[PDB]
């Protein structure tokens, strides 16, 4: 049981002894990598990425054929990181945010006036190809002389991967995760043909596609009897054939690591002493909605009851040079902007650091808790906030966010468009007594302790085994 | 078999006898209600319908039961009027146009900006409620002396009508018909609940639920599993069961009518004669896509071979008055405007006049044309060009025009967000032969030929007529 995993990026830190002086290079825990070498089946693990800082490049090309890193149990596991084109690489990554691919799996398009794909999605489509080959090719390496590879592919970038991979080693059991949502089949469909298809014919060689949600799944089988007239569909059985190809789709859904008390960040608790606070957090991404919760917030306290009421943002920077992002938090500050000049000064606050740690205690501080995404994968800090809070806050989530599945019947669950909705939820959250709040609370958590990301990898693992023994068998 | 058809406006002519001076009210052909009354197993046939004239609410109050009026055979046809509260009628129109409903099932909508419902959509939905009652009403009353009454429920206006008119008469058949499309469950979805869920609670006490287009039917039926957790689909049967009403959908597609030598409009062969000219032809709708088509024209230009070609943009106002028509409207100058500095000066030209007799003159002149919509209830001149054209024009069309499901094989189809591919396709149209194309030609119009308007509504007769004898025995 010889596993071979790759992601997009590895998490390594690298940094110099503070007594030694010597260049140091680390993984940070869970990991992932770090914990599937700690599960059962486990004999070896070898994990393969791109390579993105130059401490990366660095590293690599001292040890280009991997470089065996220790964790736990002193047991350890073998990195590998790629060297891609440089100017191949830079434009994958464009190719994967907001200006193409994002917006497609994350319902970014307006389709009356966006997109209009030209010459730049030809040429980003190429690269991508390129850019795969990089991965198979490394991954296969790295497996030559392995008798019976596992490979567990992971993250969008490596949706063509498995294609190639089922290329050259046929009887391997290949699971691709994608921690995206998948659009709908008329949605999906907006794409140029060739990559509408050409995405399809690299992830169903594979012997499981996991998703984090049921809906994702459904959406994706949708594309294929769409998009595919060799493809047969069983809604049913959760499989595609193609060509030859058994693929079963399964929804491994994920919640939290617990592998993971912070301050608040400047300020933040003087300001928000005395006063209820209502948080929002996400990356600054378009889909995280902050914009319509500020709005939110206010057709609230037009209501009345939202005296001595605060509302912090809570942002983490991200990709701020696509477009998306920036309007998307210029589209925030002119709302917290005008929800300040409306209803009084200082009742809003936005917080855009990148700290972890000033977000939990954030999470902790938390009298109202909202992650009314416009779409997510599945949304992890949903079922992490919840569990740090000791104030029995109440979570209003979006039932566009997958973690929705797992925990939309013990939360307040809203259309994510819908302002009067959402404004109705915050009221009634913050009108909601001590008890009834401190019950939903106890119940909320029963409900999203179980998703450990330990449990994740092995539906993984567990889920593949099974679905290899199928496609064997059939 | 006492017919009654509702249809949101009832096409009348309004004018004096040129010789009498007497003010005349007339019908203008085909005609939909002129057409039913044309069938065999039709008795009789009313017709209601909105008033929008001040000449309808002047006839209408003359005659509240309806005036009996009369076209082929000598035939007549009682055709009723509704006068609403002109307050709540102005905003039921808004409802229906790009600001809200018209946006939900024409993918107008980017989700990370649009749309964010306020009371506006809680103030428009209780006023489509009372909108929806009087022609409940107004048809029911209608109705109270006949036997067996069929009824034919028309446009996206009167989605609500059937629930009320099976509360009333439960043995009756029900029809709807839908001429525009349906979105996929994640976009129908993003529609306040009450707003999501109390349409399809109006639709389904339907006999059928009529679309143009399979994929309409289809997305309808996802939208109904995704809301509605009491109702069972059958994908394959294109059923419903829900509450005890049995609903069959069918795809009953529409192409021309045959019963409709024009001018062409201002200096247009002038312009136009020696040139090659490509066409594209729509309403002031941004659905339309004539600003891709344009720039799809441009990257063609610069592929070279498009010297001497020229291309006019027909357009149809509407409905200016939304902004999203407008925009598209300014979104096309803008690229006709640049078309025209890039390459050339009158290469390109706009024709915004609303006669019905010009677009036939142009669709005869045509040497390439162009319907490619981002989406498309159907698209009628898409059939009509093709069958009054001697040029043997290409046609490209979109392949979310639901006449793609009809007329795909025999055009030209293209994603409609692709510009390099809509390019290609135009310099492929314009490189092919004299006759490749006359070939290709009437083969499109013998595929075209046959969905006239007439068989359309026979299919509707004939539909209900057996789905009635289904609903009834179960
Ligand atoms: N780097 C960084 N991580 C954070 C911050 N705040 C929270 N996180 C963690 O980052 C993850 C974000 O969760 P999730 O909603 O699933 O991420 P998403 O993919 O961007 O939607 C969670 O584990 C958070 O606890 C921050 O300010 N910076
Ligand atoms: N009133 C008006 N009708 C037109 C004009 N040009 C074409 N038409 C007719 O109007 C109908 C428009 O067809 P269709 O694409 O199905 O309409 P849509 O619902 O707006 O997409 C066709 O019968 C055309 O022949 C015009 O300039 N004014």
């Known amino acids: 049981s010889e596993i071979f995993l790759a992601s997009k990026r590895a998490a390594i830190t690298y940094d110099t002894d503070p007594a030694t002086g010597e260049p140091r290079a680390w993984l940070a825990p869970g990991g992932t990598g770090n914990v599937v070498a700690e599960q059962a089946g486990v004999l070896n693990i070898s994990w393969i990425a ?41 434009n994958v990554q464009n190719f994967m945010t907001a200006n193409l691919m994002w917006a497609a799996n994350n319902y970014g398009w307006d389709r009356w006036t966006q997109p209009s794909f030209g010459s730049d999605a030809r040429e980003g489509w190429a690269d991508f190809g390129r850019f795969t080959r990089d991965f198979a090719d490394a991954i296969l390496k790295s497996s030559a002389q392995s ?44 794409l140029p043909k060739e990559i509408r298809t050409g995405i399809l014919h690299g992830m169903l060689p594979a012997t499981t596609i996991g998703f984090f949600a049921d809906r994702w799944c459904r959406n994706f089988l949708e594309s294929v009897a769409d998009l595919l007239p060799d493809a047969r569909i069983d809604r049913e059985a959760m499989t595609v054939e193609w060509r030859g190809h058994r693929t079963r789709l399964r929804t491994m859904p994920l919640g ?8 608040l960040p400047e300020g933040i608790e003087e300001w928000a002493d005395g006063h209820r606070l209502v948080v929002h957090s996400g990356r600054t991404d378009p889909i995280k909605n902050a914009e319509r919760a500020v709005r939110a917030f206010v057709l609230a306290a037009r209501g009345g009851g939202l005296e001595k009421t605060r509302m912090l943002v809570r942002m983490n920077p991200n990709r701020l040079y696509v477009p998306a992002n920036a309007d998307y938090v210029h589209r925030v500050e002119t709302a917290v902007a005008e929800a300040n000049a409306e209803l009084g000064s200082d009742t809003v606050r936005i917080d855009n650091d990148n700290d972890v740690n000033h977000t939990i205690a954030c999470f902790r501080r938390a009298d109202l ?44 669950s809203v259309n994510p468009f819908d302002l009067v909705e959402q404004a109705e939820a ?23 302790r179980p998703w450990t990301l330990e449990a994740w990898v092995q539906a993984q693992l567990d889920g593949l085994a099974a679905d290899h023994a199928a496609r064997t068998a059939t």
């Open 50 to 90: 791109s390579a993105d800082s130059e401490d990366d490049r660095r590293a690599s090309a001292l040890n280009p054929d991997g470089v065996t890193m220790e964790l736990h149990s002193g047991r350890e596991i073998l990195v590998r990181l790629i060297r891609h084109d440089p100017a191949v690489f830079r």
């Open 147 to 190: 008798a019976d590879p596992v490979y567990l592919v992971h993250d969008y970038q490596l949706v063509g991967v498995p294609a190639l991979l089922r290329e050259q080693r046929p009887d391997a059991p290949i699971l691709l995760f994608v921690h995206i949502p998948w659009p709908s089949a008329d949605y999906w469909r907006i």
């Open 256 to 263: 939290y690591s617990p592998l993971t008390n912070p301050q």
């Open 369 to 412: 808790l909202i992650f009314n995404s416009t779409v997510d994968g599945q949304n992890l800090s949903t079922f992490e906030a919840p569990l740090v809070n000791e104030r029995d806050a109440d979570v209003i989530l979006s039932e566009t966010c997958g973690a929705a599945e797992v925990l939309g019947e013990y939360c307040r």
């Open 426 to 448: 915050i009221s009634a959250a913050l009108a909601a007594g001590p008890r009834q709040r401190a019950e939903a609370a106890a119940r909320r958590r029963d409900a999203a």
